[PDB]
Structure 1
Amino acid sequence: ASSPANKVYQDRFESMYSKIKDPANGYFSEQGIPYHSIETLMVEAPDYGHVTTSQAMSYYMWLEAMHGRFSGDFTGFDKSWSVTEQYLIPTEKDQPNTSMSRYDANKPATYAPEFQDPSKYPSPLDTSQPVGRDPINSQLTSAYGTSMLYGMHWILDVDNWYGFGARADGTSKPSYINTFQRGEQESTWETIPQPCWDEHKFGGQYGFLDLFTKDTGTPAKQFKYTNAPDADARAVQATYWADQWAKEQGKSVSTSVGKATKMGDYLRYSFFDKYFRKIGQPSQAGTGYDAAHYLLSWYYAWGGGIDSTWSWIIGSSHNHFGYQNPFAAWVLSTDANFKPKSSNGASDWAKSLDRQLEFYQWLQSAEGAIAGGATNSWNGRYEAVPSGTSTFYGMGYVENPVYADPGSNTWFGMQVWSMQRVAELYYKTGDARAKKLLDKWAKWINGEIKFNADGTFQIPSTIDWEGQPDTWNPTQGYTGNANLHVKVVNYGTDLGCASSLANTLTYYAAKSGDETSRQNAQKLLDAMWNNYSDSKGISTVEQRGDYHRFLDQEVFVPAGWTGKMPNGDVIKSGVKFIDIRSKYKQDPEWQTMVAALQAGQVPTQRLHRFWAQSEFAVANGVYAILFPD
């Protein structure tokens, strides 16, 4: 039987769940897939509001798990897994096993350099550069009896707004797409959206392929997908709680547990350097697990031929603290119901749990905020790490891993998303390493929450960094990183971040007994409920400071390359963001946005992001369970 919950906060969960699931609110497509946001005029990581992301799907899982806990009905949670498998994990038709079975674990992919400006792409493939061996592929094909990968592709054009359709048909929905391809300076404003399945039917002469990669011959027809490890790890996290909550009530989500466990087994590909080079010795090809950093890196990716049979897989050399999930790693390595089938699945996750906790502590600043991360591939070309750069297992510190436009660690949101998982681990296990991190981090952030007399509040929004951590010595441990400092640049009322913050502080308070954390969590939740509720969930008006880029951002197109988007928009040198997305001019908010820009005003919007609404709902449910009085 489930323990009693605080009825006030349970009712607030239940209300939010109804608003989110309400067909009249429009959070979901007709196929039952959640959109990034209700509103369509939306550019921030996805560049259209009615895409879906693996991030949104994993929040949909967490939301439904919590509904199961309060309602006793887990059919919604099982359905969230069904929708995921149907639409976001590429099927047999989307990643033909005929190509995947031709994968060569001794030569997983061909090296190409990354560049610091999009104008340097296409990047030339070089077969002479060393590439290491993949030691896990044989474990996976042996356990699961296929060469297909079981992981979510990160983004889906749910209603076929771009027009690529499914497997180049132009008409089916949903449509697998990707955007980012051209390194750290390619913002969301500078991409050329492209189909995952490229049969050269759209775009240029060879579809979109030769915008990004240059090979010897004629570009082949080919598919490719990219994982977002932080989403797949959150799926495992959510499913663990669904299982716990289901078993407290004599119910079962065993089917979904098997899917989560399998996903966690494939998620190990994010543990490896991009081209399986040795960690801390990047000039050398790895021999297997010497190429594993055991962190959740920015991606893994795979692809292969459509009309001939070959395939490739890469991990990623770049690691951000924001992606780590020690809770998921604890689950997969210790809980017998979530032990992966592969021979080394559980022990690899055990190593990852230890490595991840070291990583957070290495990056913890003097004040307590967590700095960016590290890379095994300096400048994305395995260049020499400058003398004086601090290192973690031979990987050089990077202040803003992977993206510089804007810096990937200049947003406060990464702090809460990631420390929330450390707080669950600490709540569940009392782990000393987690305690130490949280004591200092929570003390930092409790000093940065500002409550106003009118019931409104502010928390950090944009942050900046000085210095670097001390070189990590696993036997010395944490030095205090006296020369690493966070700066709060501005404050805001980001409701998704405030919700995640409330969640983190609630788990931490429950375990540590810290009253200041508990009351800050409740005050945030109350302020949001009382002051920001609307008929669709919660919202506030926000400034969209980068929206001038709709009209003024030039998109790079190589000299002489011309093509067309499916709607006929011409792609050629000179185009702006809006020129290759001309359907955006039909958006109900377009004229409002343009009028603002014409007057030299910053446009504002009131946005209902699926992840933020779910975050708020889950944060209420968490407080209700942990603080029943």
Structure 2
Amino acid sequence: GEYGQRFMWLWNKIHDPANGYFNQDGIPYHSVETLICEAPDYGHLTTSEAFSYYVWLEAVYGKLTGDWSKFKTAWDTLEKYMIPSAEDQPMSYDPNKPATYAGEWETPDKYPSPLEFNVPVGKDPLHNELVSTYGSTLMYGMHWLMDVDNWYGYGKRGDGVSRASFINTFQRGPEESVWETVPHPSWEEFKWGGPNGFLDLFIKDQNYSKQWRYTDAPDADARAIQATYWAKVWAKEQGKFNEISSYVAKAAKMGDYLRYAMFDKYFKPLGCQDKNAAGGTGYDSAHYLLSWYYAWGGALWSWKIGSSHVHFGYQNPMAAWALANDSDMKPKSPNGASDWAKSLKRQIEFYRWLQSAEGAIAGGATNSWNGRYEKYPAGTATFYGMAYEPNPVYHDPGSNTWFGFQAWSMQRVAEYYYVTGDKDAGALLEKWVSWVKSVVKLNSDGTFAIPSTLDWSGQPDTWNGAYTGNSNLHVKVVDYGTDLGITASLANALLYYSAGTKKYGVFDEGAKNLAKELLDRMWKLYRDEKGLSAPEKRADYKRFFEQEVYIPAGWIGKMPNGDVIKSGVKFIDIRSKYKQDPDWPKLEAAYKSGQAPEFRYHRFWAQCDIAIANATYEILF
């Protein structure tokens, strides 16, 4: 079939060693080009989102093929490399005191953040159940960032040499952009950085211990699960399910632990609005959404920490439903499926509460105003006691000034609607597709433009379980662009909606046609040697040179390659190896010329989305 030809074409552009999307271990890079900085700060780093897209690409491949080897392989790599093994996470945890509270602060210069030992932390209610269920104490979820070819030089567990090195960057609050971090190893032996390693850049304590720390990106895990749901439906169609047996089980175990994404940072109760208030005793601290993260720390004592900030872009109803309803994907814990049923509905309510008057989905909510459980301002709209935030978690740039989440997240809703016919999902999607149609530009010459940067106004109405119209919440498109990963994901969302519409109501041909046009114009214009790519102006890359990384006066340390870490140091001064990047002179030239440098990037996830969107047109039509 034709749109599946398209998929095949890109699938082995991706799987051709020549083009170089994977490292020697089969770990996909964030992108083929190395000189890139946006969420990771270098291209041959990779992310938990990349792995989840890899699994998804293969699920779709084995649906179109009957060949589930590639799917099995992609999961094999993911469990092996991106999920901390037993040696990666050795422990004695106390569910009643799961962590010691530290605040979040407005700027990076207010860090390291002091522990506050008087601040009550609440009860972790998932742990004892999860031990009972699995026999293990190991946590089964992906850490979000990896240095796949050991570019930074921290290695495995401190060996400064192994590939697939667990690192972390973002640690110092909502203004710490990708440009303002100090990349550090997840496993801390004090072999680099200062006397206490890098710990004392981020946390203020009397004494510091060697330890490990991991941070899950829940959208990533959920996508992996979403992916595995389709691999289960698709293998079962073909009578090959049992082949994929234990891999659906991986998804369900992952699903079971992913419930840590559902809780306030410090198991504090929803609505508390005071750091000194008592901790939750159970599910009163569950927001039942996929939060910006869960994190687990552990001494070489133990900590577990959810997150108080939620972004709609991180939600996944399809995954939630799959875990909650499909008996093959059922998590083994007593309460697992059940918590996921609650998450499914809370998520859908969340999306509807965030729906602007125009139809775009606004950012999110927090249970911890300023990340310090402060009192909400007068007039603040709320969702189950959480405060609306236009840009939750990060502000530089604003986390919901990126059009991309609209597509990523509504694709998942559109899947859930197709499977299910849920009326709220449908009514949500209706008003959103309407908006999409009104803002996508199809030009006469066959070029197209999707929104890139969004801006926001006002607030939703406070949630009371039923849609109101949110007539004071307003989206504005600030500019347009030609992001192909997003363009394809937008197409993918339009296709699942249109499909569901045919299946459950009045068929929306408009939607399908708008998607097709996007998938067609893209394929005709932006095809190239390594897959697809469009020109991209990166003015912000001046920050390579100009961005000062905050280091405390008196703090002295070294990166593994010898770069000195001290006050005044810039972004590039702690990443000197960038100067031997093939694109360095091009970048240098443009910085001095005074105009934005240009790239034609091949992000794994982008190429994965383009693939899956074309394939999804065939599967549905």
Tell me the TM-score normalized by structure 1. Answer: 0.97
Given the alignment of the two structures, is residue 56 of structure 1 paired with residue 50 of structure 2, yes or no?
Answer: yes
Distance, in Å, in 1 between the alignment partners of 2:387 and 2:458 is: 13
Deviation at 1:62, TM superposition (A): 0.5
Q: Which residue of 2 aligns with 1:206?
A: 196
Amino acid corresponding to residue 180 of structure 1 in structure 2: F
Structure 2: stretches of 5+ with no match in the other structure: 502-506
Amino acid corresponding to residue 184 of structure 2 in structure 1: Q
Given the alignment of the two structures, is residue 193 of structure 1 paired with residue 183 of structure 2, yes or no?
Answer: yes
Give the match's secondary structure for 1:364: coil
Give the match's secondary structure for 1:128: coil
Distance, in Å, in 1 between the alignment partners of 2:371 and 2:468 is: 29
Distance, in Å, in 1 between the alignment partners of 2:390 and 2:238 is: 46
Deviation at 1:453, TM superposition (A): 2.4
Distance, in Å, in 2 between the alignment partners of 1:406 and 1:170 is: 32
Q: Which residue of 2 aligns with 1:522?
A: 516
Q: Which residue of 2 aligns with 1:269?
A: 260
Deviations 1:535-568 (A, max 9, x none): 1110011001210000000000011000000000
Q: Which residue of 2 aligns with 1:3?
A: none
Q: Which residue of 1 aligns with 2:393?
A: 402
Give the match's secondary structure for 1:210: helix
Give the match's secondary structure for 1:333: helix
Given the alignment of the two structures, is residue 466 of structure 1 paired with residue 457 of structure 2, yes or no?
Answer: yes
Deviation at 1:589, TM superposition (A): 0.2
Which of the numbers 35, 57, 67 marks the counterpart of 1:41?
A: 35
Amino acid corresponding to residue 434 of structure 1 in structure 2: A
Give the match's secondary structure for 2:328: helix
Amino acid corresponding to residue 371 of structure 2 in structure 1: G
Deviations 1:304-361 (A, max 9, x none): 111xxx1100000000000010111100000000110111001100000110011001
Which of the numbers 544, 554, 560 marks the counterpart of 1:550?
A: 544
Deviation at 1:511, TM superposition (A): 1.6
Q: Which residue of 2 aligns with 1:579?
A: 573
Deviation at 1:248, TM superposition (A): 1.2
Which of the numbers 133, 139, 143 marks the counterpart of 1:143?
A: 133
Give the match's secondary structure for 1:397: strand
Deviations 1:469-506 (A, max 9, x none): 001112xx111011110000001111011000000000
Q: Which residue of 2 aligns with 1:504?
A: 493
Amino acid corresponding to residue 153 of structure 1 in structure 2: H
Q: Which residue of 1 aligns with 2:478?
A: 489
Deviation at 1:73, TM superposition (A): 0.6
Distance, in Å, in 1 between the alignment partners of 2:600 and 2:314 is: 27
Which of the numbers 435, 457, 460 marks the counterpart of 2:448?
A: 457
Deviation at 1:365, TM superposition (A): 0.4
Distance, in Å, in 2 between the alignment partners of 1:300 and 1:547 is: 30
Give the match's secondary structure for 1:161: coil
Amino acid corresponding to residue 154 of structure 1 in structure 2: W
Amino acid corresponding to residue 426 of structure 1 in structure 2: Y
1:370-389 alignment, distance < 5 Å = 370-389=361-380
Amino acid corresponding to residue 271 of structure 1 in structure 2: M
Deviation at 1:148, TM superposition (A): 1.2
Q: Which residue of 2 aligns with 1:255?
A: 246
Distance, in Å, in 1 between the alignment partners of 2:217 and 2:544 is: 26
Distance, in Å, in 1 between the alignment partners of 2:204 and 2:211 is: 14
1:404-483 alignment, distance < 5 Å = 404-474=395-465, 477-483=466-472
Which of the numbers 238, 242, 245 marks the counterpart of 2:231?
A: 242
Deviations 1:189-216 (A, max 9, x none): 0000000000000111111110000112
Amino acid corresponding to residue 486 of structure 1 in structure 2: V
Distance, in Å, in 1 between the alignment partners of 2:345 and 2:565 is: 48
Deviations 1:156-200 (A, max 9, x none): 100000000111111111111000000000000000000000000
Which of 448-457 and 536-545 deviates more?
A: 448-457
Amino acid corresponding to residue 104 of structure 2 in structure 1: E
Deviation at 1:451, TM superposition (A): 1.3
Amino acid corresponding to residue 526 of structure 1 in structure 2: D
The percent identity for this pair of structures is: 66
Q: Which residue of 2 aligns with 1:539?
A: 533
Given the alignment of the two structures, is residue 121 of structure 1 paired with residue 115 of structure 2, yes or no?
Answer: no
Give the match's secondary structure for 2:141: coil
Distance, in Å, in 1 between the alignment partners of 2:371 and 2:440 is: 37
Q: Which residue of 1 aligns with 2:162?
A: 172
Amino acid corresponding to residue 241 of structure 1 in structure 2: W
Give the match's secondary structure for 2:19: coil
1:327-338 alignment, distance < 5 Å = 327-338=318-329
Distance, in Å, in 1 between the alignment partners of 2:334 and 2:378 is: 40
Deviations 1:380-437 (A, max 9, x none): 0000011101100111100100000000000100001000011001101100010100
Deviation at 1:81, TM superposition (A): 0.9
Give the match's secondary structure for 1:464: strand
Q: Which residue of 1 aligns with 2:97?
A: 107
Deviations 1:49-96 (A, max 9, x none): 001111000000000001101111101111111101110110011001
Distance, in Å, in 1 between the alignment partners of 2:121 and 2:604 is: 40
Let me know the Cα RMSD of the aligned residues: 0.6
Deviations 1:253-283 (A, max 9, x none): 1111010000000000010000000011243
Which of the numbers 224, 227, 245 marks the counterpart of 2:213?
A: 224
Distance, in Å, in 2 between the alignment partners of 1:535 and 1:9 is: 19
Deviations 1:425-457 (A, max 9, x none): 110110001010000000011111111222110
The answer to whether the 8 A contact 2:539-2:595 is kept is no
Given the alignment of the two structures, is residue 361 of structure 1 paired with residue 361 of structure 2, yes or no?
Answer: no
Distance, in Å, in 2 between the alignment partners of 1:459 and 1:407 is: 19
Given the alignment of the two structures, is residue 133 of structure 1 paired with residue 123 of structure 2, yes or no?
Answer: yes
Q: How many equivalent residue pairs?
A: 611
Q: Which residue of 1 aligns with 2:592?
A: 598
The answer to whether the 8 A contact 2:309-2:366 is kept is yes
Distance, in Å, in 1 between the alignment partners of 2:263 and 2:582 is: 44
Q: Which residue of 1 aligns with 2:504?
A: none
Distance, in Å, in 2 between the alignment partners of 1:286 and 1:132 is: 5
Give the match's secondary structure for 1:458: strand
Give the match's secondary structure for 1:537: coil
Distance, in Å, in 1 between the alignment partners of 2:298 and 2:417 is: 42
Deviations 1:106-135 (A, max 9, x none): 000000110010000000011111000011
Deviations 1:4-59 (A, max 9, x none): xxx11010011010101010000000000000000000100000100111100000
Distance, in Å, in 1 between the alignment partners of 2:335 and 2:553 is: 48
Amino acid corresponding to residue 470 of structure 2 in structure 1: N
Deviation at 1:150, TM superposition (A): 0.3
Give the match's secondary structure for 2:462: coil
Distance, in Å, in 2 between the alignment partners of 1:442 and 1:577 is: 40
Amino acid corresponding to residue 2 of structure 2 in structure 1: V
Give the match's secondary structure for 1:497: helix
Give the match's secondary structure for 1:368: coil
Distance, in Å, in 1 between the alignment partners of 2:82 and 2:4 is: 31
Give the match's secondary structure for 1:473: coil
Q: Displaced runs of 4+ in structure 1, greater than 6 A?
A: none
Distance, in Å, in 2 between the alignment partners of 1:250 and 1:515 is: 33
Give the match's secondary structure for 2:391: coil
The answer to whether the 8 A contact 2:29-2:50 is kept is yes
